[PDB]
Design a protein around this ligand. Structure first.
Ligand SMILES: Cc1cc(/N=N/c2ccccc2C(=O)O)ccc1O
Ligand SMILES: Cc1cc(/N=N/c2ccccc2C(=O)O)ccc1O
Ligand SMILES: Cc1cc(/N=N/c2ccccc2C(=O)O)ccc1O
Ligand SMILES: Cc1cc(/N=N/c2ccccc2C(=O)O)ccc1O
Lengths: 116, 116, 116, 116
Protein backbone atom coordinates (compact mmCIF):
# COMPACT_ATOMS: atom_id res chain seq x y z
CA UNK A 1 0.00 0.00 0.00
CA UNK A 2 2.83 2.16 1.22
CA UNK A 3 5.05 2.10 -1.87
CA UNK A 4 2.30 1.61 -4.48
CA UNK A 5 1.14 4.92 -5.95
CA UNK A 6 2.32 8.00 -7.83
CA UNK A 7 5.50 9.83 -6.79
CA UNK A 8 7.44 12.84 -8.11
CA UNK A 9 11.05 13.93 -7.77
CA UNK A 10 12.64 17.36 -7.56
CA UNK A 11 13.17 17.53 -11.35
CA UNK A 12 9.42 17.07 -11.95
CA UNK A 13 9.64 13.42 -13.17
CA UNK A 14 6.75 11.03 -12.39
CA UNK A 15 7.14 7.39 -11.17
CA UNK A 16 3.99 5.19 -11.05
CA UNK A 17 4.61 1.87 -9.26
CA UNK A 18 2.83 -1.17 -7.86
CA UNK A 19 4.49 -3.28 -5.12
CA UNK A 20 3.62 -7.01 -5.52
CA UNK A 21 3.34 -9.26 -2.46
CA UNK A 22 6.36 -11.22 -3.75
CA UNK A 23 8.81 -8.27 -3.63
CA UNK A 24 8.37 -7.23 -7.30
CA UNK A 25 8.12 -3.58 -8.41
CA UNK A 26 6.51 -2.78 -11.80
CA UNK A 27 5.34 0.51 -13.32
CA UNK A 28 6.27 3.33 -15.64
CA UNK A 29 8.58 6.34 -15.49
CA UNK A 30 7.94 9.76 -16.99
CA UNK A 31 11.08 11.85 -17.27
CA UNK A 32 11.40 15.60 -17.21
CA UNK A 33 15.09 15.63 -18.33
CA UNK A 34 17.57 14.07 -20.77
CA UNK A 35 17.05 12.75 -24.31
CA UNK A 36 13.49 11.90 -23.25
CA UNK A 37 9.95 11.37 -24.48
CA UNK A 38 6.83 9.61 -23.27
CA UNK A 39 6.88 6.93 -20.59
CA UNK A 40 9.32 4.09 -20.04
CA UNK A 41 8.91 0.66 -18.40
CA UNK A 42 10.52 0.16 -14.96
CA UNK A 43 11.17 -3.00 -12.95
CA UNK A 44 12.71 -3.45 -9.49
CA UNK A 45 12.55 -5.28 -6.17
CA UNK A 46 11.90 -4.25 -2.54
CA UNK A 47 12.14 -5.81 0.96
CA UNK A 48 8.62 -7.26 1.41
CA UNK A 49 9.25 -7.92 5.12
CA UNK A 50 11.18 -4.94 6.52
CA UNK A 51 12.27 -4.51 10.15
CA UNK A 52 13.92 1.53 9.81
CA UNK A 53 13.14 2.35 6.17
CA UNK A 54 12.39 -0.31 3.52
CA UNK A 55 15.20 -1.08 1.08
CA UNK A 56 14.40 -1.04 -2.62
CA UNK A 57 15.78 -0.46 -6.10
CA UNK A 58 14.59 -0.18 -9.72
CA UNK A 59 15.90 0.26 -13.25
CA UNK A 60 14.79 2.08 -16.39
CA UNK A 61 16.44 1.55 -19.81
CA UNK A 62 15.77 4.76 -21.75
CA UNK A 63 14.24 3.08 -24.79
CA UNK A 64 10.55 3.21 -25.72
CA UNK A 65 8.60 3.14 -29.01
CA UNK A 66 9.62 6.74 -29.69
CA UNK A 67 13.22 7.34 -28.58
CA UNK A 68 16.40 5.45 -27.64
CA UNK A 69 19.15 7.13 -25.59
CA UNK A 70 21.25 3.96 -25.30
CA UNK A 71 21.47 4.40 -21.50
CA UNK A 72 19.96 3.05 -18.28
CA UNK A 73 19.53 4.42 -14.73
CA UNK A 74 19.30 2.40 -11.50
CA UNK A 75 17.98 4.03 -8.27
CA UNK A 76 18.91 2.40 -4.93
CA UNK A 77 17.30 3.78 -1.74
CA UNK A 78 14.75 3.32 1.01
CA UNK A 79 11.07 4.10 1.47
CA UNK A 80 10.13 5.97 4.67
CA UNK A 81 6.46 6.05 5.72
CA UNK A 82 4.70 8.66 7.86
CA UNK A 83 2.59 11.77 7.36
CA UNK A 84 5.10 12.55 4.63
CA UNK A 85 6.06 9.37 2.75
CA UNK A 86 9.38 9.63 0.90
CA UNK A 87 11.73 7.51 -1.17
CA UNK A 88 15.35 8.73 -0.76
CA UNK A 89 17.74 7.46 -3.42
CA UNK A 90 21.14 7.61 -5.03
CA UNK A 91 21.31 6.67 -8.73
CA UNK A 92 23.76 5.64 -11.43
CA UNK A 93 23.14 6.50 -15.12
CA UNK A 94 25.33 4.47 -17.52
CA UNK A 95 25.60 5.26 -21.25
CA UNK A 96 26.68 2.66 -23.85
CA UNK A 97 30.13 3.73 -25.04
CA UNK A 98 33.17 2.54 -26.97
CA UNK A 99 35.97 0.92 -24.94
CA UNK A 100 38.07 4.10 -25.08
CA UNK A 101 35.31 6.17 -23.46
CA UNK A 102 34.03 3.62 -20.90
CA UNK A 103 35.92 5.32 -18.07
CA UNK A 104 33.48 8.27 -18.39
CA UNK A 105 30.25 6.29 -18.98
CA UNK A 106 28.60 6.66 -15.57
CA UNK A 107 26.99 9.61 -13.77
CA UNK A 108 25.99 9.50 -10.07
CA UNK A 109 23.29 11.63 -8.40
CA UNK A 110 20.56 11.64 -5.75
CA UNK A 111 16.77 12.00 -6.08
CA UNK A 112 14.05 12.40 -3.42
CA UNK A 113 10.51 11.29 -4.31
CA UNK A 114 7.31 12.66 -2.72
CA UNK A 115 4.10 10.64 -2.81
CA UNK A 116 0.93 12.10 -4.34
CA UNK B 1 21.65 -14.67 -26.65
CA UNK B 2 24.64 -12.43 -25.95
CA UNK B 3 23.49 -11.30 -22.49
CA UNK B 4 21.50 -14.49 -21.78
CA UNK B 5 23.66 -16.97 -19.85
CA UNK B 6 25.54 -17.61 -16.60
CA UNK B 7 28.15 -15.02 -15.48
CA UNK B 8 30.45 -14.76 -12.45
CA UNK B 9 31.91 -11.69 -10.70
CA UNK B 10 35.29 -11.32 -8.99
CA UNK B 11 33.82 -12.48 -5.65
CA UNK B 12 32.58 -15.73 -7.26
CA UNK B 13 28.82 -14.80 -7.16
CA UNK B 14 26.71 -16.36 -9.96
CA UNK B 15 24.34 -14.28 -12.12
CA UNK B 16 21.92 -16.37 -14.22
CA UNK B 17 20.02 -14.13 -16.62
CA UNK B 18 17.52 -14.22 -19.45
CA UNK B 19 17.29 -11.19 -21.77
CA UNK B 20 13.83 -10.72 -23.35
CA UNK B 21 13.38 -9.42 -26.87
CA UNK B 22 11.58 -6.38 -25.47
CA UNK B 23 14.26 -5.20 -22.96
CA UNK B 24 13.49 -7.29 -19.84
CA UNK B 25 16.21 -8.99 -17.74
CA UNK B 26 14.99 -11.78 -15.42
CA UNK B 27 16.89 -14.38 -13.40
CA UNK B 28 18.60 -15.46 -10.19
CA UNK B 29 21.68 -14.29 -8.27
CA UNK B 30 23.64 -16.55 -5.92
CA UNK B 31 25.99 -14.61 -3.69
CA UNK B 32 29.38 -15.66 -2.37
CA UNK B 33 29.30 -12.92 0.29
CA UNK B 34 27.50 -10.88 2.92
CA UNK B 35 24.64 -12.07 5.14
CA UNK B 36 23.81 -14.64 2.45
CA UNK B 37 22.21 -18.00 1.91
CA UNK B 38 20.79 -19.32 -1.35
CA UNK B 39 19.59 -17.63 -4.50
CA UNK B 40 17.77 -14.37 -4.85
CA UNK B 41 15.45 -13.09 -7.56
CA UNK B 42 16.58 -10.26 -9.83
CA UNK B 43 14.83 -8.05 -12.38
CA UNK B 44 16.27 -5.40 -14.71
CA UNK B 45 16.12 -3.67 -18.09
CA UNK B 46 18.55 -3.30 -21.04
CA UNK B 47 18.79 -1.51 -24.40
CA UNK B 48 17.30 -3.99 -26.87
CA UNK B 49 18.40 -1.89 -29.89
CA UNK B 50 21.96 -0.77 -29.16
CA UNK B 51 23.85 1.55 -31.50
CA UNK B 52 29.14 0.71 -28.61
CA UNK B 53 28.52 -1.30 -25.35
CA UNK B 54 24.93 -2.25 -24.38
CA UNK B 55 23.54 -0.30 -21.38
CA UNK B 56 21.78 -2.36 -18.71
CA UNK B 57 20.92 -2.55 -15.01
CA UNK B 58 19.31 -4.81 -12.44
CA UNK B 59 18.25 -5.06 -8.82
CA UNK B 60 18.37 -7.74 -6.14
CA UNK B 61 16.57 -7.25 -2.76
CA UNK B 62 18.41 -9.47 -0.27
CA UNK B 63 15.39 -11.42 0.94
CA UNK B 64 14.60 -15.09 0.14
CA UNK B 65 12.92 -18.00 1.99
CA UNK B 66 15.91 -18.36 4.31
CA UNK B 67 17.16 -14.91 5.29
CA UNK B 68 16.56 -11.17 4.95
CA UNK B 69 19.37 -8.62 5.14
CA UNK B 70 16.96 -5.70 4.79
CA UNK B 71 18.93 -4.23 1.87
CA UNK B 72 19.14 -4.21 -1.94
CA UNK B 73 21.85 -3.73 -4.55
CA UNK B 74 21.43 -2.16 -7.97
CA UNK B 75 24.04 -2.72 -10.70
CA UNK B 76 24.38 -0.26 -13.62
CA UNK B 77 26.73 -0.89 -16.53
CA UNK B 78 27.31 -2.19 -20.03
CA UNK B 79 27.66 -5.53 -21.79
CA UNK B 80 30.58 -5.73 -24.25
CA UNK B 81 30.37 -8.78 -26.52
CA UNK B 82 33.08 -10.58 -28.46
CA UNK B 83 35.37 -13.55 -27.99
CA UNK B 84 35.79 -12.65 -24.31
CA UNK B 85 32.48 -11.08 -23.34
CA UNK B 86 32.11 -8.96 -20.21
CA UNK B 87 29.60 -6.96 -18.20
CA UNK B 88 31.32 -3.97 -16.48
CA UNK B 89 29.30 -2.45 -13.66
CA UNK B 90 29.23 -0.05 -10.74
CA UNK B 91 26.79 -0.86 -7.89
CA UNK B 92 25.01 0.79 -4.96
CA UNK B 93 23.95 -1.31 -1.92
CA UNK B 94 21.43 0.45 0.35
CA UNK B 95 20.43 -0.87 3.78
CA UNK B 96 17.12 0.00 5.49
CA UNK B 97 18.18 2.24 8.41
CA UNK B 98 16.77 4.57 11.05
CA UNK B 99 16.82 8.26 10.08
CA UNK B 100 19.83 8.89 12.30
CA UNK B 101 21.93 6.41 10.32
CA UNK B 102 20.54 7.28 6.89
CA UNK B 103 23.63 9.34 6.01
CA UNK B 104 25.66 6.11 5.97
CA UNK B 105 23.16 3.70 4.43
CA UNK B 106 24.71 3.30 0.98
CA UNK B 107 27.88 1.45 -0.11
CA UNK B 108 29.33 1.93 -3.65
CA UNK B 109 31.59 -0.48 -5.59
CA UNK B 110 32.33 -2.02 -8.99
CA UNK B 111 31.95 -5.58 -10.35
CA UNK B 112 33.19 -7.19 -13.57
CA UNK B 113 31.22 -10.24 -14.78
CA UNK B 114 32.62 -12.89 -17.14
CA UNK B 115 31.57 -16.30 -18.35
CA UNK B 116 34.45 -18.19 -16.74
CA UNK C 1 36.60 35.70 -0.99
CA UNK C 2 33.70 33.62 -2.17
CA UNK C 3 34.82 30.20 -0.91
CA UNK C 4 36.89 31.40 2.06
CA UNK C 5 34.86 31.41 5.29
CA UNK C 6 32.85 29.19 7.63
CA UNK C 7 30.26 26.74 6.26
CA UNK C 8 27.93 24.15 7.80
CA UNK C 9 26.25 21.06 6.40
CA UNK C 10 22.89 19.46 7.15
CA UNK C 11 24.41 17.16 9.82
CA UNK C 12 25.69 20.19 11.78
CA UNK C 13 29.41 19.74 10.84
CA UNK C 14 31.59 22.86 10.45
CA UNK C 15 34.14 23.44 7.61
CA UNK C 16 36.52 26.44 7.91
CA UNK C 17 38.49 27.07 4.70
CA UNK C 18 40.79 29.57 3.02
CA UNK C 19 41.10 29.63 -0.81
CA UNK C 20 44.68 30.54 -1.90
CA UNK C 21 45.29 32.46 -5.13
CA UNK C 22 47.10 29.39 -6.49
CA UNK C 23 44.07 27.03 -6.30
CA UNK C 24 44.93 25.56 -2.86
CA UNK C 25 42.30 24.92 -0.17
CA UNK C 26 43.41 24.62 3.49
CA UNK C 27 41.43 24.61 6.74
CA UNK C 28 39.89 22.43 9.40
CA UNK C 29 36.82 20.21 9.66
CA UNK C 30 34.63 19.74 12.72
CA UNK C 31 32.44 16.67 12.48
CA UNK C 32 29.07 16.07 14.09
CA UNK C 33 28.98 12.31 13.24
CA UNK C 34 31.06 9.12 13.18
CA UNK C 35 33.92 8.00 15.43
CA UNK C 36 34.76 11.69 15.87
CA UNK C 37 36.35 14.24 18.16
CA UNK C 38 37.83 17.70 17.86
CA UNK C 39 38.93 19.19 14.54
CA UNK C 40 40.77 17.59 11.64
CA UNK C 41 43.07 19.04 8.97
CA UNK C 42 41.66 19.33 5.41
CA UNK C 43 43.39 20.03 2.10
CA UNK C 44 41.94 20.38 -1.41
CA UNK C 45 42.03 22.28 -4.70
CA UNK C 46 39.56 24.49 -6.61
CA UNK C 47 39.27 26.10 -10.08
CA UNK C 48 40.90 29.52 -9.50
CA UNK C 49 39.67 30.81 -12.87
CA UNK C 50 36.11 29.53 -13.38
CA UNK C 51 33.89 30.27 -16.39
CA UNK C 52 28.50 28.12 -13.99
CA UNK C 53 29.59 26.97 -10.53
CA UNK C 54 33.25 26.61 -9.48
CA UNK C 55 34.59 23.05 -9.32
CA UNK C 56 36.40 21.98 -6.16
CA UNK C 57 37.27 19.05 -3.92
CA UNK C 58 38.89 18.32 -0.54
CA UNK C 59 39.92 15.44 1.71
CA UNK C 60 39.95 14.75 5.44
CA UNK C 61 41.73 11.72 6.97
CA UNK C 62 39.92 11.08 10.28
CA UNK C 63 43.04 11.11 12.44
CA UNK C 64 43.95 13.87 14.90
CA UNK C 65 45.84 14.00 18.22
CA UNK C 66 42.85 12.46 19.99
CA UNK C 67 41.23 9.79 17.78
CA UNK C 68 41.93 7.64 14.71
CA UNK C 69 39.08 6.07 12.72
CA UNK C 70 41.38 4.67 10.02
CA UNK C 71 39.21 6.25 7.29
CA UNK C 72 39.14 9.24 4.93
CA UNK C 73 36.38 11.19 3.13
CA UNK C 74 36.70 13.12 -0.14
CA UNK C 75 34.00 15.67 -1.16
CA UNK C 76 33.73 16.61 -4.87
CA UNK C 77 31.32 19.42 -5.85
CA UNK C 78 30.86 23.00 -6.95
CA UNK C 79 30.57 26.37 -5.23
CA UNK C 80 27.60 28.55 -6.29
CA UNK C 81 27.65 32.25 -5.34
CA UNK C 82 24.67 34.57 -4.88
CA UNK C 83 22.52 35.89 -2.05
CA UNK C 84 22.70 32.32 -0.79
CA UNK C 85 26.18 30.87 -1.35
CA UNK C 86 26.27 27.06 -1.37
CA UNK C 87 28.69 24.21 -1.92
CA UNK C 88 26.86 21.14 -3.31
CA UNK C 89 28.81 17.89 -3.04
CA UNK C 90 28.87 14.14 -3.32
CA UNK C 91 31.37 12.30 -1.09
CA UNK C 92 33.11 8.97 -0.70
CA UNK C 93 34.17 7.66 2.76
CA UNK C 94 36.69 4.79 2.57
CA UNK C 95 37.67 2.68 5.61
CA UNK C 96 40.97 0.74 5.81
CA UNK C 97 40.02 -2.94 5.62
CA UNK C 98 41.47 -6.41 5.09
CA UNK C 99 41.49 -7.73 1.50
CA UNK C 100 38.44 -9.93 2.17
CA UNK C 101 36.34 -6.93 3.22
CA UNK C 102 37.58 -4.35 0.68
CA UNK C 103 34.50 -4.80 -1.49
CA UNK C 104 32.46 -3.10 1.29
CA UNK C 105 34.98 -0.37 2.26
CA UNK C 106 33.35 2.67 0.65
CA UNK C 107 30.21 4.66 1.47
CA UNK C 108 28.76 7.32 -0.89
CA UNK C 109 26.57 10.28 0.13
CA UNK C 110 25.78 13.93 -0.59
CA UNK C 111 26.22 17.05 1.58
CA UNK C 112 25.10 20.66 1.03
CA UNK C 113 27.04 23.42 2.80
CA UNK C 114 25.63 26.85 3.74
CA UNK C 115 27.95 29.80 4.32
CA UNK C 116 27.89 31.70 7.62
CA UNK D 1 58.20 5.38 1.91
CA UNK D 2 55.44 2.90 1.08
CA UNK D 3 53.04 5.46 -0.43
CA UNK D 4 55.81 7.83 -1.57
CA UNK D 5 56.75 7.09 -5.20
CA UNK D 6 55.50 7.07 -8.80
CA UNK D 7 52.31 5.09 -9.59
CA UNK D 8 50.31 4.51 -12.79
CA UNK D 9 46.59 3.79 -13.30
CA UNK D 10 44.94 1.63 -15.95
CA UNK D 11 44.65 4.63 -18.33
CA UNK D 12 48.43 5.23 -18.12
CA UNK D 13 48.17 8.47 -16.01
CA UNK D 14 51.16 9.11 -13.70
CA UNK D 15 50.73 9.97 -10.00
CA UNK D 16 53.91 11.26 -8.31
CA UNK D 17 53.36 11.56 -4.57
CA UNK D 18 55.15 12.39 -1.35
CA UNK D 19 53.62 11.20 1.94
CA UNK D 20 54.49 13.43 4.94
CA UNK D 21 55.04 12.00 8.41
CA UNK D 22 52.04 13.97 9.64
CA UNK D 23 49.43 12.73 7.10
CA UNK D 24 49.94 15.09 4.12
CA UNK D 25 50.01 13.88 0.49
CA UNK D 26 51.58 16.31 -2.02
CA UNK D 27 52.61 15.86 -5.66
CA UNK D 28 51.80 16.00 -9.35
CA UNK D 29 49.39 14.13 -11.65
CA UNK D 30 49.97 13.75 -15.40
CA UNK D 31 46.87 12.59 -17.21
CA UNK D 32 46.63 10.36 -20.26
CA UNK D 33 43.02 11.45 -20.90
CA UNK D 34 40.32 14.10 -21.06
CA UNK D 35 40.80 17.76 -21.97
CA UNK D 36 44.42 17.43 -20.81
CA UNK D 37 47.86 18.89 -21.28
CA UNK D 38 50.73 18.68 -18.83
CA UNK D 39 50.91 18.06 -15.11
CA UNK D 40 48.51 19.19 -12.44
CA UNK D 41 49.02 19.79 -8.74
CA UNK D 42 47.42 17.46 -6.20
CA UNK D 43 46.94 17.56 -2.43
CA UNK D 44 45.47 14.95 -0.08
CA UNK D 45 45.54 13.29 3.34
CA UNK D 46 46.18 9.73 4.60
CA UNK D 47 46.13 7.74 7.86
CA UNK D 48 49.68 8.09 9.20
CA UNK D 49 49.06 5.49 11.96
CA UNK D 50 47.17 2.63 10.30
CA UNK D 51 45.92 -0.35 12.29
CA UNK D 52 44.46 -3.51 7.30
CA UNK D 53 44.82 -1.22 4.19
CA UNK D 54 45.78 2.47 4.66
CA UNK D 55 42.92 4.93 3.99
CA UNK D 56 43.77 7.94 1.82
CA UNK D 57 42.38 10.48 -0.64
CA UNK D 58 43.42 13.32 -2.90
CA UNK D 59 42.14 16.01 -5.24
CA UNK D 60 43.23 17.44 -8.58
CA UNK D 61 41.53 20.58 -10.04
CA UNK D 62 42.03 20.37 -13.82
CA UNK D 63 43.66 23.76 -14.26
CA UNK D 64 47.35 24.41 -15.05
CA UNK D 65 49.31 27.03 -17.05
CA UNK D 66 48.08 25.56 -20.34
CA UNK D 67 44.41 24.63 -19.99
CA UNK D 68 41.40 24.64 -17.68
CA UNK D 69 38.64 22.05 -17.88
CA UNK D 70 36.64 23.72 -15.11
CA UNK D 71 36.39 20.46 -13.14
CA UNK D 72 38.09 18.45 -10.38
CA UNK D 73 38.43 14.79 -9.45
CA UNK D 74 38.70 13.38 -5.95
CA UNK D 75 40.03 9.84 -5.38
CA UNK D 76 39.18 7.92 -2.18
CA UNK D 77 40.69 4.53 -1.38
CA UNK D 78 43.34 2.47 0.34
CA UNK D 79 47.01 1.62 -0.11
CA UNK D 80 47.85 -2.08 0.29
CA UNK D 81 51.59 -2.71 0.62
CA UNK D 82 53.62 -5.84 -0.04
CA UNK D 83 55.63 -7.34 -2.88
CA UNK D 84 53.08 -6.03 -5.38
CA UNK D 85 51.79 -2.82 -3.83
CA UNK D 86 48.56 -1.19 -4.98
CA UNK D 87 46.29 1.78 -4.37
CA UNK D 88 42.62 0.83 -5.01
CA UNK D 89 40.31 3.80 -5.46
CA UNK D 90 36.88 5.05 -6.45
CA UNK D 91 36.68 8.62 -7.85
CA UNK D 92 34.16 11.42 -8.43
CA UNK D 93 34.78 13.99 -11.22
CA UNK D 94 32.60 17.12 -10.91
CA UNK D 95 32.33 19.76 -13.65
CA UNK D 96 31.31 23.39 -12.98
CA UNK D 97 27.84 23.66 -14.57
CA UNK D 98 24.82 25.94 -14.78
CA UNK D 99 22.04 25.09 -12.32
CA UNK D 100 19.98 23.47 -15.06
CA UNK D 101 22.72 20.91 -15.73
CA UNK D 102 23.76 20.41 -12.11
CA UNK D 103 21.88 17.09 -11.89
CA UNK D 104 24.39 15.60 -14.34
CA UNK D 105 27.60 17.27 -13.19
CA UNK D 106 29.29 14.30 -11.52
CA UNK D 107 30.90 11.18 -13.06
CA UNK D 108 31.87 8.17 -10.85
CA UNK D 109 34.51 5.50 -11.60
CA UNK D 110 37.30 3.36 -10.14
CA UNK D 111 41.10 3.37 -10.65
CA UNK D 112 43.78 0.89 -9.59
CA UNK D 113 47.32 2.31 -9.24
CA UNK D 114 50.49 0.20 -9.39
CA UNK D 115 54.20 0.85 -9.64
CA UNK D 116 54.64 -0.72 -13.07
C1 LIG E 1 14.49 10.61 -21.03
C2 LIG E 1 15.92 10.53 -20.51
C3 LIG E 1 16.19 10.71 -19.16
C4 LIG E 1 17.50 10.61 -18.67
N1 LIG E 1 17.82 10.78 -17.24
N2 LIG E 1 16.82 10.72 -16.44
C5 LIG E 1 17.13 10.71 -15.01
C6 LIG E 1 18.39 10.23 -14.58
C7 LIG E 1 18.68 10.19 -13.22
C8 LIG E 1 17.73 10.64 -12.29
C9 LIG E 1 16.50 11.14 -12.70
C10 LIG E 1 16.21 11.18 -14.08
C11 LIG E 1 14.81 11.64 -14.50
O1 LIG E 1 14.42 11.63 -15.65
O2 LIG E 1 13.93 11.95 -13.41
C12 LIG E 1 18.57 10.30 -19.48
C13 LIG E 1 18.31 10.08 -21.02
C14 LIG E 1 16.98 10.24 -21.37
O3 LIG E 1 16.67 10.05 -22.83
C1 LIG F 1 23.76 -12.43 0.65
C2 LIG F 1 24.06 -10.92 0.80
C3 LIG F 1 24.90 -10.28 -0.11
C4 LIG F 1 25.15 -8.90 -0.01
N1 LIG F 1 26.03 -8.19 -0.95
N2 LIG F 1 26.35 -8.75 -2.04
C5 LIG F 1 26.90 -7.94 -3.14
C6 LIG F 1 26.88 -6.54 -3.09
C7 LIG F 1 27.39 -5.80 -4.17
C8 LIG F 1 27.95 -6.45 -5.27
C9 LIG F 1 27.99 -7.84 -5.32
C10 LIG F 1 27.46 -8.58 -4.25
C11 LIG F 1 27.50 -10.11 -4.38
O1 LIG F 1 26.90 -10.95 -3.44
O2 LIG F 1 28.03 -10.50 -5.43
C12 LIG F 1 24.53 -8.12 0.96
C13 LIG F 1 23.53 -8.81 1.96
C14 LIG F 1 23.43 -10.18 1.78
O3 LIG F 1 22.53 -10.92 2.72
C1 LIG G 1 34.70 12.00 13.13
C2 LIG G 1 34.29 11.01 12.04
C3 LIG G 1 33.47 11.40 10.99
C4 LIG G 1 33.12 10.50 9.98
N1 LIG G 1 32.27 10.90 8.84
N2 LIG G 1 32.11 12.16 8.68
C5 LIG G 1 31.41 12.58 7.46
C6 LIG G 1 31.43 11.72 6.33
C7 LIG G 1 30.78 12.12 5.16
C8 LIG G 1 30.12 13.36 5.13
C9 LIG G 1 30.07 14.19 6.24
C10 LIG G 1 30.72 13.78 7.42
C11 LIG G 1 30.73 14.75 8.60
O1 LIG G 1 31.34 14.55 9.63
O2 LIG G 1 30.11 16.02 8.34
C12 LIG G 1 33.60 9.21 9.95
C13 LIG G 1 34.54 8.72 11.11
C14 LIG G 1 34.78 9.70 12.06
O3 LIG G 1 35.66 9.29 13.20
C1 LIG H 1 43.33 16.42 -18.38
C2 LIG H 1 41.89 16.09 -17.91
C3 LIG H 1 41.61 14.86 -17.31
C4 LIG H 1 40.33 14.57 -16.84
N1 LIG H 1 40.00 13.28 -16.20
N2 LIG H 1 40.94 12.53 -15.80
C5 LIG H 1 40.65 11.45 -14.85
C6 LIG H 1 39.40 11.36 -14.20
C7 LIG H 1 39.18 10.33 -13.28
C8 LIG H 1 40.16 9.37 -13.02
C9 LIG H 1 41.39 9.44 -13.67
C10 LIG H 1 41.63 10.48 -14.58
C11 LIG H 1 43.01 10.53 -15.23
O1 LIG H 1 43.41 11.58 -16.06
O2 LIG H 1 43.75 9.60 -14.88
C12 LIG H 1 39.29 15.50 -16.90
C13 LIG H 1 39.60 16.91 -17.52
C14 LIG H 1 40.89 17.04 -18.00
O3 LIG H 1 41.25 18.34 -18.64
Amino acid sequence: AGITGTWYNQLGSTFIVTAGADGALTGTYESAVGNAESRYVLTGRYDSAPASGTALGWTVAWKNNYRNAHSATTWSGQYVGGAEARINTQWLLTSGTTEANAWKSTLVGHDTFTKV
